[PDB]
């Protein structure tokens, strides 16, 4: 069902959903490439316990790209320049116990734009949920190793100062990759990334890269100074 | 083989095919979005028993859309502005006895256009066939229940007077959607509906909506008064 | 890794690859429709006797079209006008026994265009390899039968003289197709052949057609005199 | 044997050595104290397997200082202003197996300068090799503790922010040193670090310090905010 419509304000109010949903539809008149600083934060609140945080100030571009990788792609309309569907659980929907609800907030919005939220319910309830985490490589340092065991998808910020990537697999084999090779490998699973309103397609953003991780237990990044690199990693687990 | 080429008239001659075909190819110089009133009628004239009716004046837009849902789409050559492949059977082709035939006819054409029919033969024979049925919702009706048990695909005429549509599943849950929600959810299965000659792609017609029915046993329509809603449903069965 | 950057010459030198690779990346500033006479030759050199010939002076267009059939398609970029990923083995990379290495070369290049090779490494090794063969039908004859058993993919040249293409399957059934029917049927599996730089798509090349051979043991060509018809077939086998 | 000469370019091509060498001779017309940002990278390559990295983008000053500590020192001549010999194995040459080779590259050079590489081989072969690693202390942190167990040498960045540095020995005792005390103890073992072309000698550099770690299992560095501090450590292990 329709959740909220935000316009004319920089910060969206705390939105509460008491109905068990399975996915969220984000629709806005801002094109996906034009999104700059919008952030989202979704979690599950319990009456007599600690909250369960699924996302925490995740960038809208990273959230959309992580949630729409595969056969699907973000679409458009005559009135909305961006429509995306992002699922919060595998197969079924989220099971809500007593005194349990869902809370969604939006931050860093543009004054003269529009945003909408829609909730998508399912005929089933499941215990598996999606979590989003962030890993940063600082600008001052040169190389860094980050452990991505248990994750199945990552989003890299694309920059020209990054030179080398290293993948360590489960069987201990280490493979060397370049940004060009990584982009070409990424575009062999989901060729088209988005469809524009006028009819043209875009096969990938110029500042984000979607890395599918299978049997990967580590990522080493070799770069130079002057820029900060960010990874948005997605995982599935039972709460 | 080439069945017919029709131009200059408003009604097709009663065409007959004796060879066992499994699929039809409809080609025309009229774009997919420019089809208005053309209709098709297909039926197999059996010799031992009753005849088989596969399509009874089905509108050409819905006939094309109900067959090209999934990995495929309707294409366009440099000469023909619309080419579509529509299957009449499952896997193999239609099994025909010594003197049986398949009779096809077209109605409500345009005198300054051209329509071309092709038939595809297949190595195997089968008895399973696809049936296209038509359902209607009256102008004075408020809410209506339709049993879609056994079907797997429907096409509805998009109208502004339709408020809600509710899916009833096999296990007994009822989920109420919206037109926008249904469009978004259906666009994630076949993100591309057609490809134009100039290279632009179209992700969906603005006046038809395709609904895939998986484990769905009921459809409830809630709308206002003053319009007739049209559904074209496809089913697979053995005759 | 980086293999070669050929620019300013009409013939690339012999290139040796010592470590195991499983895929090549061909990149250039000429689009898929701008490749005319470029040829590629890949083989495996054994130190003490005999070589394994995978591809010998195969046209670059046919090599690219025989590898990117299916979900994938040839990519573009803001700098590279064509990128194509062609796998040289199934699943893993090519296993190398004692004292052998891969060797690649190019012929018939345009002296004012840029070509680049990249290699892809994998964490697995395999024995299966992809072999490419070429078949021809002369210009002074009318009909001819060719035997394609064991090949899973073929590429034929498209000419106006081709009238009928008869298939012969493993159960003995014979089906006669037309060029239009073949073109329509081949686009039901891969509807998009390439994605252009500006955001448009192309569903196929004008002079080349791709035929997937499943349960097919023979082909017959009925054509008029005037043009030589060329086939490039791909097979998978162990070495 | 001679490997390569570099002049004009800021980056060296990936240099391959197939003959088993045991030491590298680096020659340049810029004095040892004049090196600013030149980097070196060396690794052993297996044709079908994983590479064995010995040094990955190590500063040339640190590479030279970590190998010429003791009785030896970097020398010079009328033509070459800096000649340094760096050993890559324990007491023989690298034993290359069936398909291994050696790859060396140089990065971030100066356009108007000259660099020369030479290789030294000897009748003995061995498996023990020298590995180079790098450790860092952030520019915002006060007190840091690092582990140096198993390493036999370190090159630290001399900065005026350093106040205290305490060793921890294998018997449990902790001794605190100042920069002046550390420099004096370092020059107590190796008094002369280089001999200039004209005839003067230099005892050590103004920004790098060499620490021999004998029976030391931990280091604690106590400083103030302002800058990053780099350690380059070296170890010997069997491949």
Numbering used by the authors:
A (entry chain D), B (entry chain E), C (entry chain F), D (entry chain H): 1 to 239
What sentences appear in the manuscript?
To address distant evolutionary relationships, we determined the structure of the ΦCjT23 virion by cryo-EM. Single-particle analysis of complete particles resulted in an icosahedrally symmetric reconstruction with an average estimated resolution of 4.1 Å. The observed 200 MCP trimers, occupying four unique positions in the asymmetric unit, follow icosahedral capsid organization characterized by a pseudo-triangulation number T = 21. Within the asymmetric unit, type 1 trimers circle the five-fold symmetry axes at the vertices, type 2 trimers reside on both sides of the icosahedral two-fold axis of symmetry, type 3 trimers reside on the icosahedral three-fold axis of symmetry (contributing one MCP per asymmetric unit) and type 4 trimers reside between the rest. The asymmetric unit contains 10 independent MCP monomers, contributing a total of 20 β-sandwiches (V1 and V2). The penton domain of the spike presents one monomer per asymmetric unit and constitutes an additional building block. The dimensions of the faceted capsid are characterized by a face-to-face distance of ~55 nm, an edge-to-edge distance of ~54 nm, and a vertex-to-vertex distance of ~63 nm. Inside, a lipid bilayer with a thickness of ~5 nm is discernible. Spike proteins extend from the 12 vertices, but the density corresponding to these was disordered in the icosahedrally averaged map due to the presence of a flexible hinge region in the spike.
In this study, we report a detailed characterization of ΦCjT23, an icosahedral temperate ssDNA phage with an inner lipid membrane, isolated earlier from a strain of Flavobacterium (previously Cytophaga). The virion structure determined by cryogenic electron microscopy reveals similarities to members of the viral kingdom Bamfordvirae that currently consists solely of dsDNA viruses with a major capsid protein composed of two upright β-sandwiches. The minimalistic structure of ΦCjT23 suggests that this phage serves as a model for the last common ancestor between ssDNA and dsDNA viruses in the Bamfordvirae. Both ΦCjT23 and the related phage FLiP infect Flavobacterium species found in several environments, suggesting that these types of viruses have a global distribution and a shared evolutionary origin.
